[PDB]
Design a protein around this ligand. Sequence first.
Ligand SMILES: C[C@@H]1C(=O)NN=C2COc3cc(-c4ccccc4)c(N(C)C4(C)CN(C)C4)cc3N21
Ligand SMILES: C[C@@H]1C(=O)NN=C2COc3cc(-c4ccccc4)c(N(C)C4(C)CN(C)C4)cc3N21
Ligand code: NA
Lengths: 334, 312
Amino acid sequence: KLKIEDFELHKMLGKGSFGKVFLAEFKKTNQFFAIKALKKDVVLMDDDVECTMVEKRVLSLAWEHPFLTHMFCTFQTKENLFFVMEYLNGGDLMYHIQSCHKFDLSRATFYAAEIILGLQFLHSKGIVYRDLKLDNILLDKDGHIKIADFGMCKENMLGDAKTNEFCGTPDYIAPEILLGQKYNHSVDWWSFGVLLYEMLIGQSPFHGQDEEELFHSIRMDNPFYPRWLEKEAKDLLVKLFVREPEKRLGVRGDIRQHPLFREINWEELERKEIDPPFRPKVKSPFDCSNFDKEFLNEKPRLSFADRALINSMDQNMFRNFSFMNPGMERLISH
Amino acid sequence: LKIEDFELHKMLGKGSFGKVFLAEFKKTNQFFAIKALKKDVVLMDDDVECTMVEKRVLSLAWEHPFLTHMFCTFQTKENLFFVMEYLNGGDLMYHIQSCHKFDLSRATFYAAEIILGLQFLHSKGIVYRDLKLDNILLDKDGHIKIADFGMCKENMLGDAKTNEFCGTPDYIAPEILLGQKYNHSVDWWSFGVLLYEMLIGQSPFHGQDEEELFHSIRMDNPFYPRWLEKEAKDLLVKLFVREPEKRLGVRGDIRQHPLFREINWEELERKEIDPPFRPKVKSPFDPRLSRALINSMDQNMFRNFSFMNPGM
Ligand SMILES: C[C@@H]1C(=O)NN=C2COc3cc(-c4ccccc4)c(N(C)C4(C)CN(C)C4)cc3N21
Ligand SMILES: C[C@@H]1C(=O)NN=C2COc3cc(-c4ccccc4)c(N(C)C4(C)CN(C)C4)cc3N21
Ligand code: NA
C-alpha cells in the first residue's frame, strides 16, 4: 500500500509526450524526490511497455554506481506508472550548454570521464544504453554527472551477444544501426563521441535538413575539427568516429589511458574525490533554479486517461513493475 | 490477416457507411482502429470505386504524419475492413462544439498542419474533395489527422482536371456548383470554409435548404467581424476568390502569408512544434458486427482490396 496521495507535488520539473516529472515531497517529512509519472494508455499507444519494464529493471541495477540516476521505488495504479527517483537539481547538460554554447576543455573532459565510468558499468552488467545525449545527462547539486532515462536500454548483452532494433536520437545514431547491422555496446561509444564533440565544439558533428541527409552525413561525412581544438581532444574524437565497430576505441584498446585523461585518477573520480570544474548554483536541496520556467509555472497535475483503452487493456502488462529498496521502506513506515 | 485475429472491444462510431471499432490484435496485446464497411451498402450507394480509392490513397498516407496511417486492409464475403492507427483526441467538430470557436494560435496551428497535409496529397496527384471539421481527427498529443479519403480523385497531376459533383454542402466550391471541371483548387475553398468556422464559430455561407446554400456560396460575400485579426481576414478573403486561377493556395505561396509568420514549416512537419491545445477529454466517443444481394453480386467487384504496408 503506497499511493501518490502520500506525496505532495510541489512543482513540475519537466513535461513531454512520455509524461511528466514532478518535484515531490513524501508525507510532509522534508524528504524530497523526483517522480516521473507516466500514463499506461500513453505508454501502450507509444508501444513502450517493454521500455518501461527495461527502465525499471536497469534502475534496480543502477543503485550500485555513483554516476547513474538512483531509484528508491516504483509503483502502479490502474492508470499510472510512477518512478520515485532521487531529486537531481544541478540541471542537465543541454540546458547548461544553451547558455554558454561550448564547454571548456577541463569541464568537457571531466564530464566525458564520469560518463565513461557510467557506460562501462552498464556494459559490464550486459546493458547497452543506446540513448546517449546531452539532455539525458543530469548534474547533481555538486556538479557530478548522473546518466538518466534507461527505457531505451538492451539487457543480456554479455558475451557473444548482439541485437537489431533501429533506435536512438538521430544525431547520435551509430552507422552500424543505420546500415542494418547487428550490434553490441559499440553504438554507445559512437554516441559518446557525438556527445563529446557537442560539449567541445558546440555544434553537432553531422548535419542535414531532414533525416535522409543527416543519416547520409553520419554514414559518409568527415567530422569538422577547428584549428583551436586541443590535439588530444581531436585524437579521442577521431578514434571514436571510426565506422568499423570492432576498430572503435571503447570496443578495442583502453579509453581510460588516452592522453586526454592524463590528469585523471579513475579510482578517485569513481569515489567522487575530484571536485567538478563547474559547480551549479544551488541555494538548497529543494532548489529549482536550473529548470525551465514553462514547466515550473505550470502547476502539477495528473492527466485523465482513455478509460475505454484501460478497461480493455491486458491488466497484467506491467506485472513485476513494483520495486522497493530497503531505505525507502524505513522512510514510509514512520 | 483475418478479422478473427482482432478482438472488438468498443465501438468508436456508427453511420450509414458502417462502424468503427477499437480493436486489439490477438497475441501482441496491441490496439488499433478498424473501419468496418458492409459490402451490401457499398453496392447499393454505388460507391465501389470510392472504397478502392480509399485503400490506394491510404497506401500513400503512411509517409505523411498529419494523415491517418493505415496498417492493412482485407475483406470478407460480407464486410470490408481497414486497420488504422487508433486516434483518441476527438475530431474537430466535437471540439468546435465544445468551445464555440478556436483562438488565433490554435486555429493557425490547425490551419498550418492541414496545409501540409493537403499539399502532400496534391503533389501525389490526389485531390481530397471532402474537407470538413468532422473529417479532421486529433491524435493524443493534439496534432491533426486527416481521415476519410473515400471521396478522393487520383492522377490529378499538372494540367489535369475532373468533373464530379461531390463534397459536403457547406464546404463545396463554387466552380463545382456551376458544373465546371476543376483541379486541387476546390480543396482550397473548402480549406477557407474550415478556417472560417474555426475562427468565427459558424459557417460563412447559409441557407434553409440546399438551393439557398448553394446560392449563398455562389453570390453572397462572407461576413467578417470587426474583432477578427487583419491577417486572418486577409487570408480568408484571398482564399474566397471565386476564380480558381487567382485563388491563394493555387496561386502564390500560401505558407508565406503573414498569418503563418511565426511558424517554422519544416520544424512543424516533423512534429517539433508542440500543439497549443492538448485533449483534456481522453477518447470522447460513445460489440459485434451486424445474402441474396451478396451471392448475386459480382464477386470480383472488390478485387485487389487487400494490402499491407511494411510497418504492419
Ligand atoms: C527523473 C530525473 C531524476 O531521476 N532525478 N531528478 C530529475 C529532475 O527533474 C527531471 C526533469 C526531466 C525533464 C526536464 C525537462 C523536460 C522533461 C523532463 C528529466 N528527464 C526525463 C530528462 C532526463 C529528459 N531530459 C530533457 C531531462 C529528468 C528529471 N529528473
Ligand atoms: C478510423 C479512424 C482512424 O483512422 N483513427 N482513429 C479513429 C478513431 O475512431 C473513429 C471514429 C469515427 C467516427 C466518429 C463518430 C461517428 C462515426 C465515426 C471516424 N470517422 C469515420 C470519421 C472520419 C467521421 N467523422 C465524424 C470521424 C473515424 C475514427 N478513426
Ligand atoms: Na551533408
